[PDB]
Design a protein around this ligand. Structure first.
Ligand SMILES: Nc1ncnc2c1c(-c1ccc(Oc3ccccc3)cc1)nn2[C@H]1CCCNC1
Length: 265
């Protein structure tokens, strides 16, 4: 729902993100929130505003809540659940020697659950990666910035060959046909799992986007992380089938994950 900025407070600067500055603050006094000021000229505003009403009704424990927005001024404000420990990529890098494999698999259960809820709502992320997931004060991981890429005006961020396109998370059908589906989000989730168990290493770090696209197209797959068991690796590898329909759904994926968690006792 719309929020009167009168009911907001700006308390701290968190930095400028992909879509503009973000600040920590309090909503209605008792709610820790993160307020994003939408970079001007970056978004299809009218379309984005109308779609925001759809993305507001999405609720799930492992999905960064949207509490509301302020659109009756510019820049649009986005009021979201405050994730004190920030992006999963940076949480992973700062705490490399703190994670036991049980917490890593947990982080995968969190993400997989959020993506299974998005699967059940027929809502695609289109840019699933570790850089778009956030962590709250209890170490829980939650997905964010879902569906945002549908409204970026910069064509580098959108085209298959754009200099800013996340090639390293894209499925072959996204690179070759721009056919976005839940299966491409599954491929991306596989890459994300690899990020998690790699503790935030860049997938195909020493490959240009073109080199990555071509290697993937001819069968190359990420190496088993040092901290990944052969069963976890089997799961993220099953996410990377050439045939999209050959990839397991997030529900089947969550089940396999939970089987591994049970077997790690
Ligand atoms: N929610 C946060 N909690 C804590 N930290 C945060 C955020 C955000 C953030 C704000 C709005 C936002 O919009 C959304 C769009 C679609 C769905 C959900 C949200 C997405 C993310 N940035 N940051 C930090 C990360 C590190 C660098 N500085 C900024």
């Amino acid at each position: 729902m719309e929020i009167d900025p009168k009911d907001l407070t700006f308390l701290k600067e968190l930095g400028t993100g992909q879509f503009g500055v973000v600040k920590y603050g309090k909503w209605r006094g008792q709610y820790d929130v993160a307020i994003r000021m939408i970079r001007e000229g970056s978004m299809s505003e009218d379309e984005f505003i109308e779609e925001a009403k759809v993305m507001m009704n999405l609720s799930h424990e492992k999905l960064v809540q949207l509490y509301g927005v302020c659109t009756k001024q510019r820049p649009i404000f986005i009021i979201t659940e405050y994730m004190a420990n920030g992006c999963l990529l940076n949480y992973l890098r700062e705490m490399r020697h703190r994670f036991q494999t049980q917490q890593l698999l947990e982080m995968c259960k969190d993400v997989c659950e959020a993506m299974e809820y998005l699967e059940s709502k027929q809502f695609l992320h289109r840019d699933l990666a570790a850089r778009n997931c956030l962590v709250n004060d209890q170490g829980v991981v939650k997905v964010s910035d879902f569906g945002m890429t549908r409204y970026v005006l910069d064509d580098e961020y959108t085209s298959s060959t754009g200099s800013k396109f996340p090639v390293k998370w894209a499925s072959p059908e996204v690179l070759m046909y721009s056919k976005f589906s839940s299966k491409s989000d599954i491929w991306a989730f596989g890459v994300l799992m690899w990020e998690i168990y790699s503790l935030g290493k860049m997938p195909y770090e020493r490959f240009t986007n073109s080199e990555t696209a071509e290697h993937i197209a001819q069968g190359l797959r990420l190496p088993r992380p040092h901290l990944a068991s052969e069963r976890v690796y089997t799961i993220m590898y099953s996410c990377w089938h050439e045939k999209a329909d050959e990839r397991p759904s997030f529900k089947i994926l969550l089940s396999n994950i939970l089987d591994v968690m049970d077997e790690e006792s």
